[PDB]
C-alpha cells in the first residue's frame, strides 16, 4: 500500500528541483548575452533550450507542488480555475518539442561545421539561425496544439460534495481516436526521430573529419619524402619523377587551401617548376640547389598552415562533444518513463495471478520514472559546466 511518506518525498524533491533549475537557467541566460566574446550560432540554440525550460519551471512547478500538498486543483470553485487546467499540458509538451528540435538543429549545424572547413565565417548570430530558432519555437507550439483541447474538468462526488477533477474526455471522433494513438505519437516523435537523426548525423561527421586529416597528412608526407629522395639523387629520371610527384602534391594541397597561404603555394609551384626546367636541361647539381631552395618556403609558410589547420579542427570537435553529450543525457533521462508506459500498456496481463504485486512494484518505478524526466529540466546547466570547458570560466567570472 502506498503511503504518504512518498508523497512528502515527491513534494520536497519538487521544491528542490524548482530552486536548482531557476537560478541556473537565469544565470546562463545572463551570460549568453552579457559577455561580448560569447554569442555565436550553437550558443543561441543553447540559450533557447534554457529559456524553454525556464518557462516550464517558473509556471508549472508552483501548482504541481500544491496539488501534491493538497488533493485538489487550484480554484475548483471559481471559473478562472478552468483556464489553469489546459496550460499545464501545453507548456509541458511545448518545452519538450523545443528541446528535441533544437538538439536536431544543433546536430545538423555541427555536421555543416566540418563539411566546407576551408570556408570561414564571421561573428555574431548568423542570419539563418534567428529564423531557424523562430521556426523551431512556432513549430513546437503549433505541434503541441492537440493536447490543450478536450482537457476538461469533470465533476465527481466525495463526502457528499460535488467537486472537479481534470482529465481528457471525448468530444469528437478525431480526438477520440487521437486519445488512442497519442501514446504511440509521443514515443515516436519525441524519442524515435531525435535519437536516430543525431546518431546518423554524428556518424557522417565522424567519417568526413577523418578523411580530410588523412589527405592532409598524405600530401605533407609525400612532399617531405620526395624532398628527402631528391636530397641524395643520382640521375635526371628520378629527379624528374620526384618533382612531378611534388608538383601534383602542391596543386592538390593548394586546392584544399582556403583564400596568404595561396601566395606561398604559388611560390612553391614556381620553385618546383624552376627545378624541373633545370633537370630537363640535363644537369643534376643545379637541380639539387633548386630543390634545396624549397626549404625556406616550406619552413616559413606551409608549417604554419598545417599547424593552424590541425588546431582549428580540434576546436570544431569540442563543440560536437558538448552537443552530443547533451543529446545522450536527454535520451538517458527520458527513456524510463516511455518504457514504463509502453510496457504497462502492452505486456501487462489481467489474467495473471501475480499481476497485483508486480503492479505494486511497477507503479513505484513509474512514480520515480516521471520524476526522472522532470530532473532533466535542471540537468542542462550542470552538464554544461563540466563539459564545455569554456562555460567554466564564464560561471567562475
Amino acid at each position, epitope marked *: 500500500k502506498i503511503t504518504s511518506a512518498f508523497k512528502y518525498i515527491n513534494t520536497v524533491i519538487s521544491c528542490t528541483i524548482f530552486i536548482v533549475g531557476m537560478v541556473g537557467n537565469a544565470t546562463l541566460l545572463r551570460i549568453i548575452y552579457q559577455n561580448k566574446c560569447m554569442r555565436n550560432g550553437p550558443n543561441a540554440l543553447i540559450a533557447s533550450l534554457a529559456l524553454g525550460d525556464l518557462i516550464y519551471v517558473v509556471i508549472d512547478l508552483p501548482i504541481n507542488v500544491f496539488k501534491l500538498l493538497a488533493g485538489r486543483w487550484p480554484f475548483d470553485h471559481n471559473d478562472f480555475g478552468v483556464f489553469l487546467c489546459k496550460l499545464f499540458p501545453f507548456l509541458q509538451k511545448s518545452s519538450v518539442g523545443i528541446t528535441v528540435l533544437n538538439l536536431c538543429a544543433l546536430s545538423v549545424d555541427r555536421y555543416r561545421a566540418v563539411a566546407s572547413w576551408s570556408r570561414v565565417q564571421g561573428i555574431g548570430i548568423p542570419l539563418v539561425t534567428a529564423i531557424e530558432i523562430v521556426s523551431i519555437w512556432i513549430l513546437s507550439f503549433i505541434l503541441a496544439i492537440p493536447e490543450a483541447i478536450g482537457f476538461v474538468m469533470v465533476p465527481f462526488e466525495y463526502r457528499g460534495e460535488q467537486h472537479k477533477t481534470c482529465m481528457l474526455n471525448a468530444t469528437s471522433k478525431f480526438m477520440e481516436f487521437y486519445q488512442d494513438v497519442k501514446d504511440w505519437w509521443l514515443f515516436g516523435f519525441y524519442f524515435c526521430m531525435p535519437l536516430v537523426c543525431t546518431a546518423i548525423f554524428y556518424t557522417l561527421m565522424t567519417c568526413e573529419a577523418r578523411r580530410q586529416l588523412a589527405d592532409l597528412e598524405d600530401n605533407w608526407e609525400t612532399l617531405n619524402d620526395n624532398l628527402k629522395v631528391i636530397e641524395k639523387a643520382d640521375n635526371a629520371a628520378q629527379v624528374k619523377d620526384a618533382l*612531378t610527384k611534388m608538383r*601534383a602534391a602542391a596543386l*592538390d594541397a593548394q586546392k584544399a587551401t582556403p583564400p596568404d597561404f595561396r601566395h606561398g603555394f*604559388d611560390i612553391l*609551384v*614556381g620553385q618546383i617548376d624552376d627545378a624541373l626546367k633545370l633537370a*630537363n636541361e640535363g644537369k643534376v647539381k643545379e637541380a639539387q640547389a633548386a630543390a634545396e631552395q624549397l626549404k625556406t618556403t616550406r619552413n616559413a609558410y606551409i608549417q604554419k598552415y598545417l599547424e593552424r589547420a590541425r588546431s582549428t579542427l580540434k576546436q570544431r570537435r569540442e563543440v560536437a562533444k558538448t552537443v552530443f553529450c547533451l543529446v545522450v543525457i536527454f535520451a538517458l533521462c527520458w527513456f524510463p518513463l516511455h518504457l514504463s508506459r509502453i510496457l504497462k500498456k502492452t505486456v501487462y496481463n489481467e489474467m495473471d495471478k501475480n499481476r497485483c504485486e508486480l503492479l505494486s512494484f511497477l507503479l513505484l518505478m513509474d512514480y520515480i520514472g516521471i520524476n526522472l524526466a522532470t530532473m532533466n529540466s535542471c540537468i542542462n546547466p550542470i552538464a554544461l559546466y563540466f563539459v564545455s570547458k569554456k562555460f567554466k570560466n564564464c560561471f567562475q567570472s
Partner: antibody
Amino acid sequence: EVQLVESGGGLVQPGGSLRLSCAASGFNVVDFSLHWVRQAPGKGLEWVAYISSSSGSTSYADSVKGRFTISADTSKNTAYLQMNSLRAEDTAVYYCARWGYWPGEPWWKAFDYWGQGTLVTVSS
Amino acid sequence: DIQMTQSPSSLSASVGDRVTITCRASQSVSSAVAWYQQKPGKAPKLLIYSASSLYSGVPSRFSGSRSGTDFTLTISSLQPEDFATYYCQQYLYYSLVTFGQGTKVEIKR
C-alpha cells in the same frame, strides 16, 4: 581578334628538309608559350615540341629528338620549326597552339586557340 | 610516361540520349585534365577544364566529374551537332603532355 596561321607545307623526299612557320595576330608571343601537335592520317593526336620566348626554354619529344629544331622571333611575332632527315612515318597534319603562364587562371586554361593545320607528306 | 586510357572506342547512340565517357590516368595527376572535340577536316576545340569547368560558349549540356584518378564526361542531350571524336588530355607540366586514343560517336540504326 586572336588568330594563328601556319605555312610551309608540301611534298619532300625522304631525308629532305622543311621549314614551317606559325604566325600569331591579336596577342604578343612573349606572354604565351607555343606548342606543336601532330596527327597522323587516321590516328590519334600526338605531342611534338614547345618553346617559350620569355625565358628561351625549348623542349622536344623523344621520337623527334635530334632532327627537329624550334625557334621564335619576337620582332615579327612568329615561331619556326625546322625539320631535317625525315622518314616515312613523318607524314601527318601539324597544328600550332598557345598556352598561358603559371601564376593564375591562364595556366588552367590549357590549349585555347588552335591553328588551321598543315599537311606534310614524304614520299619517293 | 604518364599513360592515359579511354575505355569505349565507339558508341552507337541516337538523338535524345545520355552518354558517359571515362578516362583513366596511370599516375596520380591532379584535376589538370581537359576535354576536346574534333570533327573531320577541322582543328580541335575544347569544352571542359580542370575536370569540372565549362568553357565560354560551349553548351551547358556537357558536364565533367573527377574521382581519384578517374574522370567522367557526360552529355545529357545528344543534338545532331554532337557526332564527332572526343579526347582527354592531361597538362600537368609543359613537357609531360599525353593524349587519349579517341572515342567516336555515331548514329544508331
